[PDB]
Amino acid sequence: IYIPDLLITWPWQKVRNPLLQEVQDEANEWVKSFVLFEPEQFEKFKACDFNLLGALVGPLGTKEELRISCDLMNFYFAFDEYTDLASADEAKVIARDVMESFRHTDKPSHNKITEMARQFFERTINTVGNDPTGIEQFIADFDAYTTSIIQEADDRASGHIRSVEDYFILRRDTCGGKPSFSFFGLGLNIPKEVFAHPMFISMTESATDLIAITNDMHSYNLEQSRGLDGHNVITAIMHEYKINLQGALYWLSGYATKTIAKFISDRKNLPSWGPVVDRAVEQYFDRVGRCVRGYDAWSYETKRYYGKNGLEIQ
Amino acid sequence: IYIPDLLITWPWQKVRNPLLQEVQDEANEWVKSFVLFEPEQFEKFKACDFNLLGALVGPLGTKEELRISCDLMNFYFAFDEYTDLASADEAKVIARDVMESFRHTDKPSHNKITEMARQFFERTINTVGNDPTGIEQFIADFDAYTTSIIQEADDRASGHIRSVEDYFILRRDTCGGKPSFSFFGLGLNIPKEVFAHPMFISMTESATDLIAITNDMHSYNLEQSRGLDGHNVITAIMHEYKINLQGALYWLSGYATKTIAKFISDRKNLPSWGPVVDRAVEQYFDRVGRCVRGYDAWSYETKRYYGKNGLEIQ
């Protein structure tokens, strides 16, 4: 099997924040203070290695900025664990309380996950400053993310094979790209009208697809090993186009090439909103660029470790 | 080799204007009047079958509307023939004169190709009415089309294998999609500002890629049955991604799927410009839809007739 590099045409290159190993400890301290880690649960947690992910995607900056980058990825883990054996309606209330903790960090929390959420976002606004419009964008993205996951666990145990179109509509919210992008953009004070511009949304959608499909390609070998390969884009493509695994990977390479080319073209054709926000929007998608590359780096290294492997029998 | 259907997700369906056979004569009794056909030259002209293209592609309407639709396709051929043995700077002058013939149908012409151009456009404006903004769009599309072909024939006899990105930048002008779209849109009186809207340009680019890649895929067997065709998108993909023919076709299927999905998404997210313009833009891309399907229909039937079984081991 030949596995194409879906990001060969993605200009942003992999860079590890050097300040890791200097926040990796106090970051792992913080999380354990909120999660009663069982043995075997601490394993797969640290075998995922969410702090490295923060170092690959977050701004290259102060030790405090790498701090909040580590908390985001760790908070995503903690939120999923805290709501693991919760029902749909309970999960929706928990997510709504988490979003209230983000909106008002001055108000006190009422449980482990609202306190975690309150601390992490209070730290973030200390480091990054006030950003009314950015904060609203992030909470809106966090809401669409939590909804998609809670309501996909409500769909689970069903015999329908998802089409390629329906795979993307769901995975654009489930993969957690959108709230990662809007979080790393906090402080840029981008106006609400720019976030609602179709070319902003279009570039956001293209970058999310790349996070979803790279994650599925890099995890597919693992997934198909133990019948976890049912919700993968490769399975959707093989089923819908009646082609073998090799075919579906060439297909993704084509799909990826068009997606990247439209991301870059849309960047070059954005409207101007004057010099100040233009620099902000320039910086925003620079951060998205680093984020897509950083997810692909981490998602390749962790879900099939080895070295520079390119051909397997699976 | 398995050949995918690149337009399987394209909602517009193939429909032949029933008024063909009733316009095919008097329309073919026009090109003969302007081109001195030699044997072997009148062959491929009736073996290309440009009036069926007009019937597959143009609006389903009056016999006069099918007339102007067949004139455009016929004019594209007659222009290439008239400028076949011309130099680069000579070809630019002839193209500039033709565009002047479109701008001023009242003024007399000075040669075969300016008279044909004048007679075709006066008829077109008799049928569809005046369209100042639409006429400017079409002439701009026709300028970029003639320029691209004149400069490709001038660069030719060079050692460069063109990359995938450079293949698309050229072929978006060379395939004649853009002037076809703006021509079939004549009469809709779309505002100059809607033509310059990046979502209008993006949808236009997406539909042109589909015209370029369907034509190459449907002509690739012919093109390689006679060499290796170094100017085909399949050649560019095999070279650039170091994959075989089968691989490059799966790649195209993925590239087409993303392109189509972005065309439909972009249509659904156009801004509103009021009730009159919105109906105009709805009709414009409905016609582009029919045009893309119609080109794919014609170029599958012409370049390798046979039938649709799926497989063709060549």
Q: Is there a domain that residue B15 lies in?
A: no
User: What length does chain A have?
Assistant: 314
User: Which residue bears the tokens 């693991």?
Assistant: A84
Q: Which two tokens stand for residue A220?
A: 């597919």
What are the Cα distances from residue A303, in Å, to A54, A136, A210, A215?
A: 17, 33, 17, 9
Q: Which residues pair with A2 in a beta bridge?
A: A311
Mutate to test the interface with B, among A243, A245, A250, A266 (most CBs of B within 10 A): A250
Q: Is there a domain that residue A308 lies in?
A: no
| Whole-angstrom distance, CA of residue B299 vs CA of residue B305 | 9
Distance from the B36 Cα atom to the nearest Cα atom in chain A, whole angstroms = 44
A255 contacts B257? CB cut-off 8 A: yes
Q: CA neighbours within 13 Å on the CB side: how many for B120?
A: 28
| Resolution of the coordinates, Å | 2.0
Q: Is there a domain that residue B43 lies in?
A: yes
Q: Is there a domain that residue A114 lies in?
A: yes
B269 contacts A201? CB cut-off 8 A: yes
Q: Is there a domain that residue A5 lies in?
A: no
Size of interface A-B (CB pairs under 8 A): 78
Q: Which of A186, A178, A234 is nearest to A211 (CA)?
A: A178
Widest Cα–Cα separation across chain B = 56
| Whole-angstrom distance, CA of residue A195 vs CA of residue A204 | 10
Q: Is there a domain that residue A209 lies in?
A: yes
Compute the C-alpha angle B92/B157/B180, nearest 5°.
Answer: 45
User: What length does chain B have?
Assistant: 314
Domain housing A134: 23-303
Report the chain A residue with the minimal C-alpha distance to residue B253. Answer: A251
Q: Is there a domain that residue B87 lies in?
A: yes
Q: Is there a domain that residue B164 lies in?
A: yes
Comparing CB atoms, the residue among B202, B250, B259 nearest residue A258 is B259
B255 contacts A250? CB cut-off 8 A: no
Q: Which of A287, A184, A166 is nearest to A237 (CA)?
A: A166
**Long-range contacts of residues A111-119, Cβ cutoff 8 Å, at least 24 apart:** A112/A34, A112/A82, A113/A34, A113/A78, A113/A79, A113/A82, A113/A83, A115/A34, A116/A34, A116/A75, A116/A78, A117/A75, A117/A79, A119/A30
Which chain B residues touch A201 with a CB distance below 8 Å?
269
> Who's near B230: CB < 8 A, 6+ residues apart?
B161, B162
Helix (H) or strand (E) holding B256: helix B245-268
CATH number at residue B114: 1.10.600.10
A199 contacts B199? CB cut-off 8 A: yes
Neighbours of A235 (CB within 10 A): 20
Q: What is the 3-state secondary structure (H, E, C) of B55-82?
A: HHHCCCCCHHHHHHHHHHHHHHHHHHHH
Please check whether residue A189 is in contact with residue A135, taking contact to mean a CB–CB distance below 8 angstroms. no
Please check whether residue A24 is in contact with residue A51, taking contact to mean a CB–CB distance below 8 angstroms. yes
Spell B204-234 as b/e; 16+ CB within 10 A means b.
Answer: bbbbbbbbbbbbbbbbbbebeeeeebebbbb
Q: Which residues pair with A311 in a beta bridge?
A: A2
In chain A, the number of structural domains is: 1
Name the DSSP class of B311.
B
